[PDB]
Amino acid sequence: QVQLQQPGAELVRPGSSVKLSCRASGYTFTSYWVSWVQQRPGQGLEWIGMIHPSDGEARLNQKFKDKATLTVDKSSTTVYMQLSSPTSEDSAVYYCALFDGYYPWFASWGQGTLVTVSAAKTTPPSVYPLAPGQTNSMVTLGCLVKGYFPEPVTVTWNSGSLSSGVHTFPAVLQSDLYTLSSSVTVPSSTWPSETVTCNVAHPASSTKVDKKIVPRD
Amino acid sequence: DIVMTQSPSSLALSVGQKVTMNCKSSQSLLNSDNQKNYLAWYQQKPGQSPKLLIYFASTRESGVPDRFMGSGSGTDFNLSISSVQPEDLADYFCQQHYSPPLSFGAGTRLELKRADAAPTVSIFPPSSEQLTSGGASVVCFLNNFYPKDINVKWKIDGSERQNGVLNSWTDQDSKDSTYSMSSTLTLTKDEYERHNSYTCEATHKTSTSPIVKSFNRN
Amino acid sequence: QKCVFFAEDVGSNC
Incomplete structure (x- = not known):
């Protein structure tokens, strides 16, 4: 099987060198064009350009002429794309892809590298309990996860034992840091008698925070 | 640069129903000499890399079920599914493979229909x-x-x-x-x-x- | 090889 091995995530500091790697295996590296393809957060795909590893010839999209540098290491059968002067505008998933032989469509893809451009320092989250200030058969409780970097955080409720009625929302960019929230919906007769705690794991800061939701005084 | 338009950008479906997704391009993708249209279709699911469905407008990639069907000519193309399955709930985008630079549509997301529900x-x-x-x-x-x-x-x-x-x-x-x-x-x-x-x-x-x-x- | 089966030969390396 053809394999294109890309790292999961790279964090690159502004005005610094984004060198993205695509390790090829299971085929003759020097025979076929390798493209790079950009996917901004839910924005659809942009072809950056392609390189022939036999000699390192690069044909770029005109859009990426002053932005993308493509190279090749034949001895590690690896393709590199380098982004010059990267900004938050260039934060995206970058795929490498192989032409279906000599045909200009993509049978084989890498898993893509999530590239975050940012000057933010590793910061653990602040976790705020969201408790109700009204009676119904169900009650919704929450956790606000604010000012962490980088992605990702992992949110569970009661250490994974509450999973039904949970909505963990995708992170938003706030003040060059990440904010996120999670809601849990349980029967009213069961809270606060049976306790409800949100667990927020941030591996990059080697930090976990638990907040028990208690009724507002 | 050839511009690829997929409208609409989402469809709500019952399982078993036929869906047709549209892709238009700014220039004809028909080659007069071989009478072939240079469009590809892809399936993508969140947190996953795209998967080739169709090339030359209507040729299924081997392994792709025959309920997937590509059609059209010139500037107007359709991807149909004859009975939409749960696993077919995905994003689908077209790509002109006519001339460089290669270009993609913004995709059409296929979603499940259900009764209206109040937040x-x-x-x-x-x-x-x-x-x-x-x-x-x-x-x-x-x-x-x-x-x-x-x-x-x-x-x-x-x-x-x-x-x-x-x-x-x-x-x-x-x-x-x-x-x-x-x-x-x-x-x-x-x-x-x-x-x-x-x-x-x-x-x-x-x-x-x-x-x-x-x-x-x- | 470097030739790519684009519909036209302009910038195809064919």
Whole structure:
């Protein structure tokens, strides 16, 4: 099987060198064009350009002429794309892809590298309990996860034992840091008698925070 | 650069139904000499890399089930599925493979139809812990609604407020096929303490009126 | 090889 091995995530500091790697295996590296393809957060795909590893010839999209540098290491059968002067505008998933032989469509893809451009320092989250200030058969409780970097955080409720009625929302960019929230919906007769705690794991800061939701005084 | 247009960008489906997704291009993809159209189709699912379905407009990639069918000519192309299966719930985008630079459509997302459902709205004041640090985030969850289209507006003491609103949406629920949304108004404690009345307002197909949750700081 | 089966030969390396 053809394999294109890309790292999961790279964090690159502004005005610094984004060198993205695509390790090829299971085929003759020097025979076929390798493209790079950009996917901004839910924005659809942009072809950056392609390189022939036999000699390192690069044909770029005109859009990426002053932005993308493509190279090749034949001895590690690896393709590199380098982004010059990267900004938050260039934060995206970058795929490498192989032409279906000599045909200009993509049978084989890498898993893509999530590239975050940012000057933010590793910061653990602040976790705020969201408790109700009204009676119904169900009650919704929450956790606000604010000012962490980088992605990702992992949110569970009661250490994974509450999973039904949970909505963990995708992170938003706030003040060059990440904010996120999670809601849990349980029967009213069961809270606060049976306790409800949100667990927020941030591996990059080697930090976990638990907040028990208690009724507002 | 050849421009690829896929409209509409989402379709709501029952399983077993035939769906047809459209792709237009700014220039004809027909080659007069071989009479072949240079368009590819792809399937993508969130957190996954794209998968080749169709090339030369109508040739299925081996391994692709025959319920997938590509058609059209010149500037107008369709990907059909004869019986949409659960595993077919994905994004699909076209790519002209006619001339460089290669170019893609913005995709059409295939979603599951279900009965209209009204959002469950909860508003939460700032916690004391955030306040002592000079921040005041007001959180609004609008949960388990359908369809996906929703507009949320914040009011402070009667006035609409736009600065410091950050919104986040879930993909369709695999269990109940609803959508959920989180809206957060972040103020300084200083601005939070100068106002009384905080309202979260939902415009959704399921109601003629705003769906509204508010609290007073007192 | 470097030739790519684009519909036209302009910038195809064919």
